[PDB]
Amino acid sequence: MSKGEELFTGVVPILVELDGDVNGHKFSVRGEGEGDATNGKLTLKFICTTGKLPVPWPTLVTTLVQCFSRYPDHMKRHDFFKSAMPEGYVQERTISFKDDGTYKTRAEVKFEGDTLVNRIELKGIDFKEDGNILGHKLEYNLRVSTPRWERIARVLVCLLGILLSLYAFHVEREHARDPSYKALCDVSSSISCSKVFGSRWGRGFGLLGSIFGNDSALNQPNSVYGIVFYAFQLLLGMTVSAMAALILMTTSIMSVVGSLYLGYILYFVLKDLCVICVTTYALNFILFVLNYKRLVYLNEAWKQKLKQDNSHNVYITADKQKNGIKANFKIRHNVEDGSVQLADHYQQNTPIGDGPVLLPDNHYLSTQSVLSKDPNEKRDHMVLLEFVTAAGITHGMDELYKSNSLEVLFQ
C-alpha cells in the first residue's frame, strides 16, 4: 500500500556512502549494488576509499536499506519503508557494544533518479584500543552459533526444571512430614502427592548415602541436585564451546540414567505415581536430546552449510508521535577466541517528505547476511549478500512460535 511500493517491483540500483569517525579515526566507505524487494535480496560491494578500515567490517553491516525487505502481501500494510518513498526517510541508530564503545549513525535513505541512495554519517566513541572492535578480533561473518529454537527450548526446559525443583523442595520441607499430607494423599490425586519425598530415595537418590555419610551434606534431597543441575545446564548452555558441550552431554547422560533409576523405583519397588518426577524425567530427556543435537551440529555444521538459519530478527514498533517507527535488536558478533561481543541496536526512522506513511503493528524482519571477498579487489572491501523477509503476523496457530509476541521474549 503506497506509490512507494510501486518503485520496488523490479531490480533497483543501490548506492551507499558513509563518512565515519571512530575514536578520532576518520574513514570513508562507498558501496554499490542492486536490490530485489520481491525476493528480499541485496547484492552489494563496499570499499574503504581511505585505506584500511579501523573497525571490523561486520560492525558496519547494520549501518550500511530496509526498504528492500520482502513484505508478504498480508503484511504489506505494515511496510513503513516503502511507503516513505521516493522522498525517503531518515534512519538514526545508537549501537552500544557491551564493555566497549558506541556507534551513533544518522542516515538519509531516498531515491535519486533511478538509484536508491543511502548516505550515512557515523561516529564511534569510547572504544577500547585492545577491545574486540579496535583490535580487529571479530570474525568476518554474521552467523548464529547455535540455532534459535534450541536456545529457546533450552532456556524454557531449564527454567521449568528449576521451578519444579524449587516446588519439590518446598514440598519436601514444608509438606512431606505432616500427617495430614499422608491422610490427604491417600484420598486425593494431587501434583504435590508423592511417596518419594518422605522416603529413602528422597535424599541423595537413596544411593550416595551408603556411598557417603547418610548424614553428610553431600547427601541431599533430589530437588537440590535439581536446582543445581538445571541452573548449571542453563548457565553453561549460554556458552557455545566444545568443552561446554561435552560437559553438558555428560551431565545429561547422568540425568537420564538417574531418571531411569528413580523411574524403575517409581513403578516397581515403590508402587505409586509422581507427576513432578515424571515431568522432570521428560525435561532430562529433552536436555539430553538438545545436548546431543548441539554436538552433532558442532561436528556436521560444515556439511549442513548447504541449510543454516543465521537469521537476525530486528523488532519494529510504530512511533505515532513522530510519524515513524522504532526498532530494537541485538547482534552477537563472534570473537576469534570463542567469546561473544554483543551489539545493542536502538533505531528510529522518520519520513523525509509529507506524505501518507504506513504505521505498522509490531513485527520483525528476519535478516540473513553473507560476507565474502573479491579476489580482484586490492582495496579494503566487503562483498555482501542479504536476504530480508518480514514476519510476525498471521491468523493460524500452526505457526504461532513465529509470532512477534513470542519472539521478542527471546533475544
CSV table of C-alpha atoms in Angstrom, one decimal:
chain,number,residue,atom,x,y,z
A,1,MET,CA,0.0,0.0,0.0
A,2,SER,CA,1.6,3.1,-1.5
A,3,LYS,CA,3.0,4.7,-4.6
A,4,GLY,CA,6.3,3.9,-2.8
A,5,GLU,CA,5.6,0.1,-3.2
A,6,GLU,CA,5.4,0.5,-7.0
A,7,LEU,CA,9.1,1.6,-7.1
A,8,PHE,CA,10.4,-1.8,-5.8
A,9,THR,CA,8.7,-4.1,-8.3
A,10,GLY,CA,12.0,-4.8,-10.2
A,11,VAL,CA,15.7,-4.5,-9.7
A,12,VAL,CA,16.8,-1.2,-8.2
A,13,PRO,CA,20.4,0.2,-8.3
A,14,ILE,CA,21.8,1.0,-4.9
A,15,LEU,CA,24.5,3.5,-3.9
A,16,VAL,CA,25.8,3.7,-0.3
A,17,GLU,CA,28.2,6.4,1.0
A,18,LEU,CA,29.4,6.6,4.6
A,19,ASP,CA,31.7,9.0,6.4
A,20,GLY,CA,32.9,7.8,9.8
A,21,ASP,CA,34.9,8.8,12.8
A,22,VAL,CA,35.7,6.2,15.5
A,23,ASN,CA,37.9,7.3,18.4
A,24,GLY,CA,39.3,10.1,16.1
A,25,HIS,CA,40.0,7.8,13.1
A,26,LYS,CA,38.2,9.2,10.0
A,27,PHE,CA,37.3,6.9,7.1
A,28,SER,CA,35.0,6.7,4.0
A,29,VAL,CA,33.2,3.7,2.6
A,30,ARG,CA,31.5,3.6,-0.8
A,31,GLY,CA,29.4,0.7,-1.8
A,32,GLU,CA,27.3,0.0,-4.9
A,33,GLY,CA,25.0,-2.8,-5.9
A,34,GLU,CA,21.4,-3.7,-6.6
A,35,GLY,CA,18.3,-4.8,-4.6
A,36,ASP,CA,15.3,-7.0,-5.4
A,37,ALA,CA,12.5,-6.4,-3.0
A,38,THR,CA,10.4,-9.2,-4.5
A,39,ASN,CA,13.0,-11.8,-3.3
A,40,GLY,CA,14.2,-9.6,-0.4
A,41,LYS,CA,17.7,-9.9,-1.9
A,42,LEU,CA,20.5,-7.4,-1.6
A,43,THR,CA,23.8,-7.7,-3.6
A,44,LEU,CA,26.3,-5.1,-2.7
A,45,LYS,CA,30.1,-4.4,-2.7
A,46,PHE,CA,31.7,-1.9,-0.3
A,47,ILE,CA,35.2,-0.4,-0.5
A,48,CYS,CA,37.0,1.7,2.1
A,49,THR,CA,38.2,4.7,0.0
A,50,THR,CA,40.6,5.9,2.7
A,51,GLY,CA,43.0,3.0,3.1
A,52,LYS,CA,42.5,0.3,5.8
A,53,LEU,CA,39.4,0.2,7.9
A,54,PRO,CA,39.7,1.0,11.6
A,55,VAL,CA,36.7,-1.2,12.6
A,56,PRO,CA,35.7,-4.7,11.6
A,57,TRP,CA,33.5,-4.9,8.5
A,58,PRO,CA,30.8,-6.9,10.4
A,59,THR,CA,30.3,-4.0,12.8
A,60,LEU,CA,29.2,-1.8,9.9
A,61,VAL,CA,26.7,-4.2,8.2
A,62,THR,CA,23.7,-2.9,10.0
A,63,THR,CA,24.8,0.7,9.4
A,64,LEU,CA,25.4,0.2,5.7
A,65,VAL,CA,18.3,0.0,3.4
A,66,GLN,CA,15.4,-2.0,4.9
A,67,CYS,CA,13.1,-0.7,2.1
A,68,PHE,CA,14.3,-3.8,0.1
A,69,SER,CA,12.8,-6.2,2.7
A,70,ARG,CA,10.3,-8.7,1.3
A,71,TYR,CA,6.9,-8.0,2.8
A,72,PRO,CA,4.3,-10.7,2.3
A,73,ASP,CA,1.0,-9.4,0.9
A,74,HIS,CA,-0.7,-9.9,4.3
A,75,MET,CA,1.8,-7.6,5.9
A,76,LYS,CA,2.1,-5.1,3.1
A,77,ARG,CA,0.1,-2.5,5.1
A,78,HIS,CA,2.8,-2.6,7.7
A,79,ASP,CA,5.7,-1.6,5.4
A,80,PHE,CA,6.8,1.8,6.5
A,81,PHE,CA,10.0,1.9,4.5
A,82,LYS,CA,8.4,1.6,1.0
A,83,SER,CA,5.5,4.0,1.8
A,84,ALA,CA,8.1,6.8,2.6
A,85,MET,CA,9.5,6.6,-1.0
A,86,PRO,CA,10.5,8.3,-3.2
A,87,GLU,CA,11.0,11.1,-0.7
A,88,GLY,CA,12.7,8.6,1.7
A,89,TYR,CA,13.3,8.5,5.4
A,90,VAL,CA,15.9,9.4,8.0
A,91,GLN,CA,17.3,6.5,9.9
A,92,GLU,CA,19.1,7.1,13.2
A,93,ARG,CA,20.8,4.5,15.3
A,94,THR,CA,22.6,4.1,18.6
A,95,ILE,CA,24.6,0.9,18.7
A,96,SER,CA,26.1,0.0,22.1
A,97,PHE,CA,28.9,-2.6,22.1
A,98,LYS,CA,29.0,-4.2,25.5
A,99,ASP,CA,32.1,-3.3,27.6
A,100,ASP,CA,33.2,-1.2,24.6
A,101,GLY,CA,32.4,1.9,22.6
A,102,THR,CA,29.2,3.1,20.9
A,103,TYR,CA,28.2,4.0,17.3
A,104,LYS,CA,25.9,7.0,16.6
A,105,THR,CA,24.7,6.9,13.0
A,106,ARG,CA,22.4,9.3,11.1
A,107,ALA,CA,21.4,8.4,7.5
A,108,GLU,CA,19.2,9.5,4.7
A,109,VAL,CA,17.6,6.8,2.5
A,110,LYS,CA,15.9,8.3,-0.6
A,111,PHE,CA,15.5,7.9,-4.3
A,112,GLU,CA,17.8,9.9,-6.6
A,113,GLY,CA,16.6,9.3,-10.1
A,114,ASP,CA,16.7,5.6,-10.6
A,115,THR,CA,19.1,4.9,-7.8
A,116,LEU,CA,18.2,4.2,-4.1
A,117,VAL,CA,20.8,6.2,-2.2
A,118,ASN,CA,21.7,5.7,1.5
A,119,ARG,CA,24.0,8.4,2.8
A,120,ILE,CA,25.4,7.8,6.3
A,121,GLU,CA,27.3,9.8,8.9
A,122,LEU,CA,28.7,7.6,11.7
A,123,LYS,CA,30.7,8.5,14.8
A,124,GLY,CA,32.0,5.9,17.3
A,125,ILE,CA,33.2,6.9,20.8
A,126,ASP,CA,34.8,5.3,23.9
A,127,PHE,CA,36.2,2.3,22.1
A,128,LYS,CA,39.0,0.3,23.8
A,129,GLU,CA,42.3,0.2,21.8
A,130,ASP,CA,42.7,-3.5,22.5
A,131,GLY,CA,38.9,-4.3,22.5
A,132,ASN,CA,37.3,-6.6,20.1
A,133,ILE,CA,36.5,-3.8,17.7
A,134,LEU,CA,39.6,-1.6,17.5
A,135,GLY,CA,41.7,-4.7,17.9
A,136,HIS,CA,40.0,-6.5,14.9
A,137,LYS,CA,39.2,-9.6,16.9
A,138,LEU,CA,35.8,-10.2,15.4
A,139,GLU,CA,35.1,-13.0,12.9
A,140,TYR,CA,34.3,-12.0,9.3
A,141,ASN,CA,30.7,-13.1,9.3
A,142,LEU,CA,27.3,-12.6,10.9
A,143,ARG,CA,26.4,-16.2,11.7
A,144,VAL,CA,24.4,-17.6,14.6
A,145,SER,CA,26.4,-20.1,16.6
A,146,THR,CA,23.5,-22.1,18.0
A,147,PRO,CA,20.1,-22.3,16.3
A,148,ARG,CA,17.5,-20.1,17.8
A,149,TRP,CA,14.9,-22.7,18.6
A,150,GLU,CA,17.5,-24.7,20.5
A,151,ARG,CA,18.3,-21.7,22.7
A,152,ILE,CA,14.6,-21.0,23.4
A,153,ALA,CA,13.9,-24.7,24.2
A,154,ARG,CA,17.0,-24.9,26.4
A,155,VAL,CA,16.1,-21.9,28.5
A,156,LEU,CA,12.5,-23.0,28.7
A,157,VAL,CA,13.3,-26.5,29.8
A,158,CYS,CA,15.9,-25.3,32.3
A,159,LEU,CA,13.6,-22.7,33.8
A,160,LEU,CA,10.7,-25.2,34.2
A,161,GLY,CA,13.2,-27.6,35.7
A,162,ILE,CA,14.3,-25.0,38.2
A,163,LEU,CA,10.7,-24.2,39.1
A,164,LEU,CA,9.7,-27.9,39.5
A,165,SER,CA,12.9,-28.3,41.6
A,166,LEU,CA,12.0,-25.4,43.9
A,167,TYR,CA,8.5,-26.7,44.3
A,168,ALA,CA,9.6,-30.3,45.0
A,169,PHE,CA,12.0,-28.8,47.6
A,170,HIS,CA,9.1,-26.8,49.1
A,171,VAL,CA,7.0,-30.0,49.4
A,172,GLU,CA,9.9,-31.9,50.9
A,173,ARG,CA,10.5,-29.2,53.5
A,174,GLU,CA,7.0,-27.8,54.4
A,175,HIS,CA,4.6,-30.5,53.3
A,176,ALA,CA,6.1,-34.0,53.4
A,177,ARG,CA,6.4,-34.5,57.1
A,178,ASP,CA,2.9,-33.6,58.1
A,179,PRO,CA,0.5,-36.5,58.8
A,180,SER,CA,-2.4,-34.6,57.1
A,181,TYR,CA,-0.2,-34.9,54.0
A,182,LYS,CA,-0.3,-38.7,54.2
A,183,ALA,CA,-4.0,-38.7,55.0
A,184,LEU,CA,-5.0,-36.4,52.2
A,185,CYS,CA,-2.8,-38.1,49.6
A,186,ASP,CA,-4.3,-41.4,50.4
A,187,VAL,CA,-7.7,-40.0,49.3
A,188,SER,CA,-6.8,-37.3,46.7
A,189,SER,CA,-4.8,-37.2,43.5
A,190,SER,CA,-2.6,-34.1,43.7
A,191,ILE,CA,0.5,-32.9,41.9
A,192,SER,CA,2.0,-32.4,45.4
A,193,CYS,CA,1.3,-36.0,46.3
A,194,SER,CA,4.2,-38.5,46.0
A,195,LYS,CA,5.6,-41.2,48.3
A,196,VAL,CA,9.3,-40.5,47.4
A,197,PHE,CA,9.6,-37.2,49.3
A,198,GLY,CA,9.5,-38.8,52.7
A,199,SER,CA,11.3,-41.9,51.5
A,200,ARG,CA,14.7,-43.5,51.2
A,201,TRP,CA,15.2,-42.1,47.6
A,202,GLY,CA,14.1,-38.6,48.6
A,203,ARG,CA,17.6,-37.7,49.8
A,204,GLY,CA,20.6,-38.2,47.5
A,205,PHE,CA,18.7,-40.6,45.3
A,206,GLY,CA,18.8,-43.3,48.1
A,207,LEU,CA,22.4,-44.0,46.9
A,208,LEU,CA,25.2,-41.5,47.5
A,209,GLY,CA,24.3,-42.2,51.1
A,210,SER,CA,25.8,-45.5,52.0
A,211,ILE,CA,28.3,-44.3,49.4
A,212,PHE,CA,28.7,-41.3,51.8
A,213,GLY,CA,27.7,-40.5,55.4
A,214,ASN,CA,23.9,-40.7,55.2
A,215,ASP,CA,24.1,-37.5,57.4
A,216,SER,CA,26.9,-35.8,55.4
A,217,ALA,CA,25.9,-32.6,53.5
A,218,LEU,CA,26.7,-34.5,50.2
A,219,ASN,CA,23.5,-36.5,50.8
A,220,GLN,CA,20.8,-34.0,49.7
A,221,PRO,CA,17.2,-34.0,48.7
A,222,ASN,CA,16.9,-34.6,44.9
A,223,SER,CA,15.4,-31.2,44.4
A,224,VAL,CA,18.8,-29.7,45.3
A,225,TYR,CA,20.5,-31.6,42.6
A,226,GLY,CA,17.6,-30.3,40.6
A,227,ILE,CA,18.2,-26.6,41.0
A,228,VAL,CA,21.9,-27.2,40.7
A,229,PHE,CA,21.7,-29.4,37.5
A,230,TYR,CA,19.2,-27.2,35.7
A,231,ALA,CA,20.8,-23.9,36.6
A,232,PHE,CA,24.2,-25.4,35.6
A,233,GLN,CA,22.8,-26.6,32.3
A,234,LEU,CA,21.3,-23.1,31.8
A,235,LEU,CA,24.4,-21.1,32.5
A,236,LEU,CA,26.7,-23.4,30.6
A,237,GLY,CA,24.1,-23.6,27.8
A,238,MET,CA,24.8,-19.9,27.2
A,239,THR,CA,28.4,-20.8,26.3
A,240,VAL,CA,29.0,-22.5,22.9
A,241,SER,CA,32.2,-24.4,23.3
A,242,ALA,CA,33.4,-28.0,22.7
A,243,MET,CA,34.3,-28.2,26.4
A,244,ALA,CA,30.9,-26.9,27.4
A,245,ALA,CA,29.1,-29.2,25.0
A,246,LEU,CA,31.0,-32.2,26.4
A,247,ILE,CA,30.3,-31.3,30.0
A,248,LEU,CA,26.6,-30.7,29.3
A,249,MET,CA,26.4,-34.0,27.4
A,250,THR,CA,27.9,-36.0,30.3
A,251,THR,CA,25.7,-34.3,32.9
A,252,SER,CA,22.6,-35.0,30.7
A,253,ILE,CA,23.6,-38.7,30.4
A,254,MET,CA,23.8,-38.8,34.2
A,255,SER,CA,20.4,-37.2,34.4
A,256,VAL,CA,18.8,-39.7,32.1
A,257,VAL,CA,20.3,-42.7,33.9
A,258,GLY,CA,19.2,-41.3,37.2
A,259,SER,CA,15.8,-40.7,35.7
A,260,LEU,CA,15.6,-44.3,34.6
A,261,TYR,CA,16.7,-45.5,38.0
A,262,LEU,CA,14.2,-43.5,40.0
A,263,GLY,CA,11.6,-44.3,37.4
A,264,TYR,CA,12.2,-48.0,38.0
A,265,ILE,CA,11.9,-47.4,41.7
A,266,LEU,CA,8.7,-45.4,41.0
A,267,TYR,CA,7.0,-48.2,39.0
A,268,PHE,CA,8.2,-51.4,40.7
A,269,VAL,CA,9.8,-51.1,44.1
A,270,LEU,CA,7.8,-48.1,45.3
A,271,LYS,CA,4.5,-48.6,43.6
A,272,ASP,CA,2.9,-45.1,43.2
A,273,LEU,CA,2.8,-42.2,40.8
A,274,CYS,CA,4.7,-38.9,41.0
A,275,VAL,CA,3.8,-36.3,38.4
A,276,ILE,CA,6.7,-34.0,39.4
A,277,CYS,CA,9.2,-36.8,39.0
A,278,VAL,CA,7.9,-37.9,35.6
A,279,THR,CA,7.8,-34.3,34.3
A,280,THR,CA,11.4,-33.8,35.4
A,281,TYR,CA,12.4,-37.0,33.7
A,282,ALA,CA,10.9,-35.7,30.5
A,283,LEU,CA,12.8,-32.5,30.9
A,284,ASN,CA,16.0,-34.5,31.4
A,285,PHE,CA,15.3,-36.4,28.2
A,286,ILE,CA,14.7,-33.1,26.4
A,287,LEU,CA,18.0,-31.6,27.7
A,288,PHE,CA,19.8,-34.8,26.6
A,289,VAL,CA,18.3,-34.5,23.1
A,290,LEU,CA,19.3,-30.8,22.9
A,291,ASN,CA,22.9,-31.5,24.0
A,292,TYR,CA,23.3,-34.4,21.5
A,293,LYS,CA,21.9,-32.1,18.8
A,294,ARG,CA,24.4,-29.4,19.8
A,295,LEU,CA,27.3,-31.9,19.5
A,296,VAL,CA,26.0,-33.2,16.1
A,297,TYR,CA,25.7,-29.6,14.9
A,298,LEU,CA,29.2,-28.9,16.2
A,299,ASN,CA,30.6,-31.7,14.1
A,300,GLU,CA,28.4,-31.5,10.9
A,301,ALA,CA,27.6,-27.8,10.6
A,302,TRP,CA,30.2,-27.5,7.9
A,303,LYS,CA,28.3,-30.1,5.8
A,304,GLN,CA,24.9,-28.5,6.6
A,305,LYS,CA,26.0,-25.1,5.4
A,306,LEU,CA,24.3,-26.3,2.2
A,307,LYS,CA,20.7,-25.0,5.2
A,308,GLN,CA,21.8,-22.9,8.3
A,309,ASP,CA,19.4,-20.3,9.6
A,310,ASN,CA,21.8,-17.5,10.6
A,311,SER,CA,18.9,-15.1,10.8
A,312,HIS,CA,18.7,-12.0,13.0
A,313,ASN,CA,15.3,-10.5,13.8
A,314,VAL,CA,15.0,-6.7,14.0
A,315,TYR,CA,12.0,-5.8,16.1
A,316,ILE,CA,9.8,-2.9,14.7
A,317,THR,CA,7.1,-1.0,16.5
A,318,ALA,CA,5.2,2.1,15.5
A,319,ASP,CA,6.0,5.6,16.6
A,320,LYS,CA,2.9,7.8,16.0
A,321,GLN,CA,4.3,10.8,17.9
A,322,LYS,CA,7.0,11.2,15.2
A,323,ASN,CA,5.0,9.7,12.3
A,324,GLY,CA,7.7,7.0,12.0
A,325,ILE,CA,8.9,3.7,13.6
A,326,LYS,CA,11.3,2.5,16.3
A,327,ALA,CA,13.3,-0.7,16.1
A,328,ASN,CA,15.4,-2.7,18.6
A,329,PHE,CA,17.6,-5.7,18.2
A,330,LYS,CA,20.8,-7.4,19.4
A,331,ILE,CA,23.6,-8.6,17.1
A,332,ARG,CA,26.0,-11.2,18.6
A,333,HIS,CA,29.4,-10.9,16.9
A,334,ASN,CA,31.6,-14.0,17.4
A,335,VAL,CA,35.2,-13.3,18.6
A,336,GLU,CA,38.2,-15.3,17.4
A,337,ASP,CA,39.0,-16.7,20.9
A,338,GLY,CA,35.5,-18.1,21.3
A,339,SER,CA,33.9,-15.3,23.2
A,340,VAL,CA,31.0,-13.2,22.1
A,341,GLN,CA,30.8,-9.4,21.5
A,342,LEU,CA,27.2,-8.1,22.0
A,343,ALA,CA,25.8,-5.2,20.0
A,344,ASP,CA,22.6,-3.4,21.1
A,345,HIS,CA,20.8,-1.7,18.3
A,346,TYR,CA,18.4,1.2,19.1
A,347,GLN,CA,16.8,2.6,15.9
A,348,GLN,CA,14.3,5.2,14.8
A,349,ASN,CA,13.0,6.1,11.3
A,350,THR,CA,11.1,9.3,10.4
A,351,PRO,CA,9.8,10.2,6.9
A,352,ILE,CA,11.5,12.9,5.0
A,353,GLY,CA,8.6,14.2,2.9
A,354,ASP,CA,5.0,15.0,3.8
A,355,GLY,CA,3.0,12.0,2.5
A,356,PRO,CA,0.9,9.2,3.8
A,357,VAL,CA,3.2,6.7,5.5
A,358,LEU,CA,2.2,3.3,6.9
A,359,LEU,CA,2.4,3.0,10.7
A,360,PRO,CA,2.8,-0.7,11.3
A,361,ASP,CA,1.8,-3.2,14.0
A,362,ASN,CA,4.6,-4.7,16.0
A,363,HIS,CA,6.5,-7.1,13.7
A,364,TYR,CA,10.1,-8.1,12.8
A,365,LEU,CA,12.4,-8.5,9.9
A,366,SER,CA,14.4,-11.8,9.5
A,367,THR,CA,17.7,-10.8,8.1
A,368,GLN,CA,20.4,-13.2,6.8
A,369,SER,CA,23.8,-11.8,5.7
A,370,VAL,CA,26.7,-13.5,3.8
A,371,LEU,CA,30.1,-11.7,3.8
A,372,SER,CA,32.8,-12.5,1.3
A,373,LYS,CA,35.7,-11.0,-0.6
A,374,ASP,CA,36.5,-10.0,-4.1
A,375,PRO,CA,39.9,-11.5,-5.2
A,376,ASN,CA,40.2,-8.9,-7.9
A,377,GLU,CA,39.8,-6.0,-5.4
A,378,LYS,CA,43.1,-4.8,-3.9
A,379,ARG,CA,41.4,-2.3,-1.5
A,380,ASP,CA,39.9,-3.0,1.9
A,381,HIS,CA,36.5,-4.1,0.9
A,382,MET,CA,33.5,-6.3,1.6
A,383,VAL,CA,31.0,-8.3,-0.6
A,384,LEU,CA,27.6,-8.5,1.0
A,385,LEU,CA,24.6,-10.7,0.1
A,386,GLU,CA,21.5,-10.2,2.2
A,387,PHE,CA,18.1,-11.9,2.5
A,388,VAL,CA,15.5,-9.9,4.5
A,389,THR,CA,11.9,-11.1,4.9
A,390,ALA,CA,9.2,-9.6,7.1
A,391,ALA,CA,7.4,-11.8,9.6
A,392,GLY,CA,5.5,-11.9,12.9
A,393,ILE,CA,1.8,-11.6,11.9
A,394,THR,CA,-0.6,-14.4,10.9
A,395,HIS,CA,-4.0,-15.8,12.0
A,396,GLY,CA,-3.3,-19.5,12.4
A,397,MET,CA,-1.9,-21.3,15.4
A,398,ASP,CA,0.1,-23.9,13.4
A,399,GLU,CA,2.8,-21.2,13.2
A,400,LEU,CA,2.5,-19.4,16.5
A,401,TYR,CA,6.1,-19.8,17.7
A,402,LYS,CA,6.8,-17.4,14.8
A,403,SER,CA,4.6,-14.6,16.2
A,404,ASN,CA,6.1,-11.4,17.3
A,405,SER,CA,4.7,-11.7,20.9
A,406,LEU,CA,6.8,-14.8,21.4
A,407,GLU,CA,9.9,-13.9,19.5
A,408,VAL,CA,10.6,-10.7,21.4
A,409,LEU,CA,10.9,-12.5,24.7
A,410,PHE,CA,13.9,-14.5,23.4
A,411,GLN,CA,16.5,-12.0,22.0
